[PDB]
Each structure stands twice: as C-alpha cells, then as structure tokens.
Paper text:
The main replication protein [name] plays a critical role in cell cycle arrest, transactivation of viral and host genes, and replication and package of [name] genome. Based on its similarity to other parvoviral replication proteins, such as Rep72 of the adeno-associated virus (AAV), [name] is predicted to contain one nuclease domain (Nuc, aa 1–176), one oligomerization domain (OD, aa 201–270), one SF3 helicase domain (SF3 HD, aa 271–501), and one zinc-binding domain (ZnD, aa 571–671). The SF3 HD domain of [name] belongs to the SF3 helicase superfamily, which unwinds DNA with 3′→5′ polarity. Totally, four cryo-electron microscopy (cryo-EM) structures were determined, which revealed the detailed mechanisms for ATP binding and hydrolysis and DNA binding and unwinding by [name].
Author numbering:
A (entry chain L), B (entry chain B), C (entry chain A), D (entry chain F): 202 to 278, 286 to 499
The structure:
C-alpha cells in the first residue's frame, strides 16, 4: 500500500521526533518520563496542548514498541562469568538451548506452546530469572496486580505476562487456557476485526504442580492434558547459595546476545517435536567455550 | 452419683432394648434400618408413637455409639496374608507402629495432633486405607459431601471425618486450624455450656502439599508452621498392582486387633515428643512375627 | 443379622397387610388408591389415625417396590404376532438381544452404561417403545415435568427416568454426566450417609445428536467422549405405518417373558466389552422361533 | 383388583353414610352445608374430630362428584314452553343437535374440540345460557375469579370452566392452548404422576373474534389455526326482549333430558368430522315435535 501523501507542519514533525525519542530511550510511563527528563515534562505540561501530546505520544510509543518492532530487538546488543549461565548450569540445563528457546518464544514463534513454566522447591532461582527477563522487555504485566476475579484484565500493550507463585482455579480455567496457548480473547477479536492478532507470552513460577486444578475444597485432573499441551517445563531442583544477588538487564542481554550468535542447527532439531519437559544437559553436544 | 430411683414400665424396657439392639447391630440410619429389618420398621410406622420412637431411638443409639463407648472398642473384635500389612510394608513403613498410632488417634489420646495425612503420587493406596478405616467405625462424614462454603457443617455425632484429595483455602483456614487441631467449635461450647467438647479426628489424603494455603490466585506459606503442629504425615510413594482390590473391614479389624495384642513399649518413647513426620521402618526393630 | 424380637399388635399386623396389598396391586398414589378402592380410602380417611396411616403405607409401599424388590420381577409374568418383535425387526435389530439387554439394564447390572438412547427420524416408534416400558415399571419420572433449571429433582424413589426429545446444555452437563452414569449426587450421599448409593436407569429419545453440547449459541464437542462411555445407542430409521396402534404393557410383558426364558450366552459373549453402538442383526445367528 | 380385607367400625360407616348424603344432596361447600343443614353442622363442630370430619367429607364428596361419576348424570333428571329451545330457534340453530353436542362435550368425548364458543353482538343471551349450564354441574370455576397473571391456576376439581367476555393475550396463549385443547399442565402430571390425568370442558363468550391474539399494542394472527382446531363456534346474532328472565337449572335439565331420547344419527355422521362452525337448521330433517 502506497502511504498517503499528506504533509505535516513543523509541530507535527516535532511531535513525531518526540515519539521516536520516547521509543528509543525505553520511556513508557509518566513516572519514567519525570525521572528521566523533568525539564521536557514540565515544559509540556504548561498548557492543554502539551498535556494532550504527552498522552498521545505515550500511547503511540507503546503501540510502536509492542506491535511494530520485534520484542527480541529489545533484547540484543567472557561468557563463563555470566550469572545466568552459571545458574542454568547449576540446575543441569544447557544455556544455549534455553536462550534460543527464549528468543523464539518471546517473538511468538513457538506455535501453541506459548507458556514457560519454572518449577522447584524454595530459594532455587526462579523469580530472579523471571524478573530479569521481565525487566528487559519494553512493557510487562503481572497477574498479581490484577483483581482476583479478573486475573487477565490488562494484557493488551504488554510484551510479557508474569504469574508468580500462581495456582489455577476451576472458575478461570477456561480463560487461562485461552491465554496460556496464545488464543486471543473474544473482545480482542471484536474490536480488532480479525479472528487472531495480538498474542502474548506467559511465564509462570510455582512451588507446586499447576496441572492440578482446584475445584471447591478439592482438586481435579481433567484439565491436565490441555494445559500440558501449551507449556514447557523447567525443573529448578537445586538450591542456590546466597552468594548471588539480583539479576540485571545487562546479564540477560549479554546472555541472549551470545546465544543468538552461535549455531542454531540443534534447536530446530528439537522443534519437530516440542516436548512438555525441556531436554536435559549433555556433554557430547555442549558448547566448547562452556567447558 | 447415685442414679435416680425411677421405675420403668413394659414400654420403657422395650424401648431401651430396641435402643440397645440398634447400637449393637451397627445401624444408625433409617435406610439401614429398612434394609436390615423391614418388619420392625413397618410395625413401628403404623402410628404416631412408633414414628416418634424411631427417631428417638436412632438419636439415642447414635449418641451412645459416638459418646459413651470408645471408638477403638468397635474396631477390635496368618497375618502375612493381610493386605494392610503388605501395603504398609511396600511403603517403607512399620505396620505395628502405624496400627498403634491409629488405635491411639481414634480415641483422641494424641493431644493437639488430631489429624492424619496420607501423601503421595497417583494410585499408591490412600483412598483405600482411609475408606476401610472409615467403614470400620460406626459413623463417619466427608468434607466432600458438605457444601463448598461450609466444609465443616456437620461434625457432631461423627466418629471420623474424611477429607479426600482436598486443598486448604485462605477463606476457611481459621476454621480448618481449629477443626484439625481438635479444638471444639464455639457453637458447641455455647450449646453444651462447657469448654470440654471432645472434637473429632480428621484424616486427609492428597496429591500435593496442603501446607501452602491457596489465597487469591497464589499460594502463601505463612500458616505452614501452625498446620505442622496438628498433623502426622505418611508418604505413599511406591505404586501398587492393579489386581489388589477394595480393602475390607475384616482386614482392618484383624490388623488392629493383632497390633493391640502385642507390646506397647516403643510407642510412648516416640510419644514423649511427637514428630510431624512419621518415622520409617527400622531394619532390626521389626517385630519377629513380621521379619 | 437376627431381627428384633418385638411383637406387633392387631393394628400393626393389619397395617402391614395393607402395605403388602398396596405393593401387590401396584398402587403408589392417592389418586390411584381412590380409583381402585374408594371404600377403603373413605373408611380410612374418617379420622386422623387413618389419614396418617394412608401416607405411611404409601411411603412404605413405594420404598419396598423401589429398593427391596428387583424391577425385573415387575416386568416378568405366538411371539411372532407381537408388535415389539416386529418393530425391532423392521429396524434390523434382534429382539431377543434387545430384551435381554433391557432386563440387565433395568436392574442396574451394566456398570457405567446406565443410559439407553433412541435416535432416528420422526415417526419411527421411539416414544411408543419407551413410554411402554415406563408404563410397565411401578414408578417412573420424566425430565420434561421438572423445572428447566432443575431437570433432576425427583430421581429418588423412581424405577426409571424418561427424557423425551431432549438436548443437553452446558449448564447442566456436569450433573447430566453423573446421573447418566449411575453415580449419586453429594446431597444423596450426605443424606444417606453411605457414599455407595444406587442410581436410576435413564432412557432418552431425540431427533438429533445429543453428544453436541449447547453452549451459548454454539455446539461444542468437548464432552463427546465421556458421554459415549455411558450410553447405548439404537437407530430407528424405517418409518412406521400410520395405523400402528398404541403399544400396551401386556406386549412388553409377553416379549420380556419370552426373551428371559431363552439362552443367554449370546449376551455375555458380547458383554465383556460394551460398545457405544448396539450390534446389528445377524440372520445366521437369529433365533429359529421368530424366523 | 380385589378390595382390601379391612372393614370399618360404626363411626367409619356413619362417616361413609354422611359422605354419600353430601354427594347426593349436592352440598360441596361449608356455606351450603350451613344453609341446608345447620343442625348437623352445629353438632359436628362441637369437637376437633367433627371439624376434621367436615373437611374430609367435603373433599371426598368433591372427588366423587368430579371423578367417579359422569357429569351428564347430574343433568339427566310441553317442550315448546321451554326457554332454551325458543332461544336456540330464534338464533337459527337446531336445539336437538345443540343438546346432544352439550351432552357429549360435558363428558369429554369430543376429542380435541374441548371448547365451546358463543359469539355475537351485545344482549343476545350468552352469559345467560352459559351460566345456567354451570349452575347445573356440581362445581365450576371461572377465569374471571383467578389472578390476571395466572388465569388457569385453579382448575383441578371442577366440572366446567367459564370464560366470560374473554380475550387472549400473547403471554398466556401457550398455556391456554393446553386448557382449550384438553391437555394437562406439567404441574398436574408432576403431582399426579401420569400423562393425561384430567381435562376440563371450557365455555367462552365474547363480543369479538378471539382467534386474534393480542400482542403488545397490536394484534397477531399466527395462532388462529390451532384455536380454530380446538373450538366449536356458534353465532348469537339476534338479541332478546327484556321481558325474558333468568335461565334456571330446571330448563337445562328438561331440555337435555328431552334431547337424550330422540335419536343419535344426525349427530353421529357429524361427529365423524367436526366443523369449526355449528351447522344451522335444516327444515328437510327437523324433529316432528318442534316442526
Ligand atoms: N532482592 C534480592 N536481593 C538479593 N538477592 C536476592 C534477592 N531476591 C532473591 N535473591 C537471591 O536469589 C536466590 C534465589 O531467590 P529467588 O529467585 O527469589 O528464589 P525462588 O526460587 O523464586 N524462591 P521462592 O519464591 O521462595 O520459591 C537466593 O540466593 C537469594 O538470596
Ligand atoms: N473400586 C475399586 N475396585 C477395585 N480395586 C480398587 C478400586 N479402587 C481402588 N482399587 C485398587 O486399589 C489401588 C489403589 O487405588 P486408590 O486407593 O484409589 O489410590 P489413590 O492413591 O487414592 N489414588 P489417586 O486418587 O489417584 O491419588 C488401585 O491401584 C487398585 O488396585
Ligand atoms: N397415541 C397413538 N395412538 C396410536 N398410534 C400411535 C400413537 N402414537 C404413535 N402411534 C403410532 O406409532 C408410530 C410411532 O409414533 P411415535 O412413537 O409417536 O413416534 P416418534 O418416533 O416418537 N416420532 P417423533 O417424536 O416425531 O420423532 C406411528 O406410526 C404412529 O402412527
Ligand atoms: N340479572 C338479570 N335479571 C333479569 N334478566 C336478565 C338478567 N341477566 C340477563 N337477563 C335477561 O337475559 C337477556 C340476555 O342478557 P345476557 O345473557 O347478559 O346477554 P349477553 O349477550 O351475554 N351480554 P353482553 O354481551 O355482556 O351485553 C337480557 O336481555 C335479559 O332479558
Ligand atoms: Mg518467588
Ligand atoms: Mg485417591
Ligand atoms: Mg416422539
Ligand atoms: Mg354477556
């Protein structure tokens, strides 16, 4: 489609430049704008026009970051000292395959297996890898912030949804299957006009088996197969020492950048058959620098 | 206290004999009365007096069974062929200590540890050992039968309460802590005019860990300590042939009688300080009749 | 169990004789009692005692008919001229096998398969063959009489439940799966206090496929596997003559009496594995009497 | 069917005699009993037993009069002077045919044509003829008495239902089709336990075409065909002078008794296939008495 030949004024060009600046510097909230540039916010908020422009530019930046640019782009751009690879080696997992799977999963290139699940016993490194990952995406949401009766109230405009120490009830199990597999909600179909558009990755950490759905004062098992069809499970069964601090965006960015450079030939070999359980660590097919 | 000098008539003695028969024949409901002796039920149901007497005698027999006679008397009435012993041996547990603890627990002689917990993965023998105990006692009740919002609605007049594959919610945890610890409910305290209401033993089977209380869409571990003060845990890990069938009342009675017949020296050594987790079988402490 | 040695009076014996008379003559409602014997009803209803006795005897007779005497005895009491065998032959079915299956089904001896489904184009005999078994049993109930939101109100005390031109909605599918399989509800288990409560046979006639569950304005197939495990399906294709005539209980009694006397091996050879579709006719194995 | 062995005492026999007296003398309400025999009512109301017996006898007499005895028997108890025959001659109708049709319709022998409709212009004798036939039957009801939302709430136990100056709305048109066609409501089937327990004759008088069903603020015609099927119509197109007075029970009884013993041929052919409109006179075939 040939773009419309409409020509803008100087104010429109400056507004577009400000939107580009907002998207470039990963500023997506009013508080972040105040913390990053108080001068521009103060100058803009002196009139009605600037107040309208702030909201309009914020919305446009959200849309551009979550719809027009791949999420992995806000993930990229000597590896043995990284904390992420050491953590993934402690729990006997291959860092390269996990990184490639994360790269493919955050771009909605894994099919119906839209959910990533972390499982294991207390202090084993789970809300630390999930929340480092979440802090590197442009916008992320959480199920804990939302109301109990509406756990999926706000999923549009987000790059990731985090469910921390979560359990699935029979009241919402029908809705969760829609969001854990990537199926759009009905209202998203209605306003967009198509049958499937938005999509959103989901990451879950828990201490117990979420395949068991609580019904009343008891538990059922009839929903196990459908839930297992849509998840990839990792076992964090090795406790970690308190010698490790918080995981930061730089560590995960470096880890993913290093993973993206190496050979991908192994990954699609697994991609013929996506398994519920992630493959375990090997030694014949390990990366030479990781030894 | 010297009993009152009241003298009964022929009808009173007949009614007392009927109550004794009802209590001795282990019949406590109208349906079992019709099934066992339809002639007497039909003869009584011919007038208002007989209809009143049916309900009065049923209530009196229930009270006598659940309050005046210890439950362990009903349970009591070669051993290799017993399925209970083999099932408990396959699960790395000593049948003798388990039997002694069951005998002491059903009589409310364990203190604050009023709950028995069976934990383990699918088909390992748990709704089997529990519902043969439930049928070995005069009257038992289920949390499953009760309403969702009132799990502990009916506990008066019961010798046992069974919670099958259940989960503890945060909206009912306050009543759960009281009922699983043997603490009498406030309504019974008010109605009976005393603070010495006995309380009912509880048995729980589950696939997951019930010390993680379901709150909202997450699980909390704040109560995990307190619950551990009121429960004894048994792990059922090994699985069992699909050929062994329903376990029966005769097997439970024989196992409990044989357990009671032996010595009672090792139990009170453990009873000095009760442990949350039931100890496993010992290599040399096993009874000669079981080695 | 030795029955209670209590002895009844003359009035008790007369009441028991009246209950037996009510059972023998298949009188289970007040209107039928008035129609059959107005003299005894008028004599009894002259005082409070007789009015109480009427209801007591009716309840006892219903209970004895439903729970203490097998229903097949009420059905049991040349064959080429019978209408039922001709109707079942027109639809390419063996009347002997159908009769034996009906006899085993009405006594709750089929396990999980408690439902009988008649399906086909209109005017093919479905209501006729089903509402003749219903009139042959002592007491029968109808799903159509009950409320729309509560289709399973009166299922206790019934020998058969009839669902005519029925469709399964998504709101009642949970209770429908339980009732069609012969399992009891929580209320029945709690009131009886026996967990093992017998179910009631169900017969359904319909013009469409009832495995498609109505949800909203759509039909779904997520329950089509559990429903087929509980049902036996017969196809009524051949249209019937416009002067077929209303079927009579005597025809059903004659057909079932003839079927019960014949050999059974051709039934339990198939009864190891129950199929969703009823086996079709076989001229080689057809009984020589009705050739 | 054999009556029960039970025989009554003196009190039971006296109660049965009192019930027979109540049924014979056409006393079916307490006010009628006080008006006809105040002495017996006063002696009965001395104690609780007589008060119970009064209600029991009234209910038994009502049931006997409305279920065990044909209605026409209450109606079958020179001919020029009769007012009914003169009125029917002034309306261009054959009195013999009307009498025979009334006799066959009061006994529920007309099939689906359970309703009788009188239509015509103001003051032409219609609340007259219809309320003189209702005075002859033991017990009758009226749609006027009942609530507007539930016009057919109390129809059990009546020999006739009168709908005076009526009109059919779209809210109840489904229920009326049951009453006007003679089919039982689901409540009657539920309580009695059968499929076709009762059926009540209906008589309707109106000044307009009742086949037009009122819907909202407009009129529909989609229900006309069924109403035409379930009804028989007469045209009272001639008004009457005010000298004529009321129509009594004696006139109706004499008219119906006279029509009962003339012939049953000119009706028998018509009963082969009923027409919506009642045939008019025919001087070719008219009875010599009134000719
Ligand atoms: N805010 C923090 N600052 C420093 N170290 C932290 C912090 N949070 C967690 N850690 C460390 O990270 C490791 C695991 O913590 P965490 O990732 O929260 O565990 P987890 O498996 O998610 N726990 P749990 O929620 O109890 O099942 C431990 O070594 C902690 O000491
Ligand atoms: N109804 C039954 N009839 C015959 N045998 C049975 C029955 N139920 C259980 N069994 C036998 O008992 C074994 C244990 O079953 P069960 O006691 O139900 O296990 P469980 O651990 O409670 N199961 P689950 O509820 O899946 O955690 C089975 O493997 C069968 O061999
Ligand atoms: N009341 C009746 N009296 C006489 N014959 C009847 C009666 N009802 C049905 N039949 C006959 O029996 C046959 C079966 O009719 P019926 O059993 O009502 O049909 P059905 O299979 O339920 N049809 P439908 O409900 O339209 O799918 C027809 O050929 C009818 O003529
Ligand atoms: N209460 C009465 N007292 C005396 N005569 C009456 C009475 N009611 C009716 N009549 C006579 O019966 C005739 C018919 O009246 P009625 O039967 O009420 O007519 P209708 O056509 O049913 N009425 P409507 O359509 O409501 O105007 C009258 O013209 C009177 O002669
Ligand atoms: Mg955590
Ligand atoms: Mg179990
Ligand atoms: Mg039909
Ligand atoms: Mg009028």
């Amino acid at each position: 489609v040939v773009p419309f030949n409409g020509k803008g004024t100087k104010a429109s060009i400056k507004f577009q430049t400000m939107v580009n600046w907002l998207c470039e510097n990963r500023v997506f909230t009013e508080d972040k704008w105040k913390l990053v540039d108080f001068n521009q916010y103060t100058l803009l908020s002196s009139s009605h026009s600037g107040s309208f422009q702030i909201q309009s530019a914020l919305k446009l930046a959200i849309y551009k970051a979550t719809n027009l640019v791949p999420t992995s782009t806000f993930l990229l751009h000597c590896i043995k000292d990284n904390k992420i690879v050491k953590l993934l080696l402690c729990q006997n997992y291959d860092p390269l395959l996990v990184g490639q799977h994360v790269l493919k999963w955050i771009d909605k290139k894994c099919g119906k297996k839209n959910t990533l699940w972390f499982y294991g016993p207390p202090s084993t490194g789970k809300t630390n890898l999930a929340m480092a990952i979440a802090k590197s995406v442009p916008v992320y949401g959480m199920v804990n912030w939302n109301n109990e009766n509406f756990p999926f109230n706000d999923v549009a405009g987000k790059s990731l949804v985090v469910w921390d120490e979560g359990i699935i009830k029979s009241t919402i199990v029908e809705a969760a299957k829609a969001i854990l597999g990537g199926q759009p909600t009905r209202v998203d179909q209605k306003m967009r006009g198509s049958v499937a558009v938005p999509g959103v990755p989901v990451v879950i950490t828990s201490n117990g088996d979420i395949t068991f759905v609580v019904s009343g004062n008891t538990t059922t098992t009839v929903h196990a197969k459908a839930l297992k069809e849509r998840m990839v499970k990792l076992n964090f069964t090795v406790r970690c020492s308190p010698d490790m601090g918080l995981l930061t965006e730089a560590d995960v960015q470096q880890w993913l950048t290093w993973c993206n450079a190496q050979s991908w030939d192994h990954y699609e070999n697994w991609a013929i058959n996506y398994t519920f359980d992630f493959p375990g660590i090997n030694a014949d097919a390990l990366h030479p620098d990781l030894q």
